[PDB]
Amino acid sequence: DQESCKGRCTEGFNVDKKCQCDELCSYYQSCCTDYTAECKPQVTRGDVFTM
């Protein structure tokens, strides 16, 4: 069995969950398997305003 960020990206911190798919995971080493390319918080540029 396996999962990904789809439905989880920046959901917010709750350390009981199997993925810390959020802003605080680096402090707990409990993040998604590819956080920095799949779950990384918004970095808006001028042409995207949606979550």
- Count how many domains the chain has: 1
Domain residue limits at 36: 1-51
- Experimental approach was NMR
- Furthest-apart CA atoms within the chain: distance in Å: 38
Alpha-carbon distance of 35 to 51, in angstroms, equals 16
Task: Report the length, in residues, of the chain.
Answer: 51
Tokens 């199997």 belong to 18
Q: Which residues contact 31 (CB under 8 A, 6 or more apart)?
A: 19, 20, 21, 25, 39
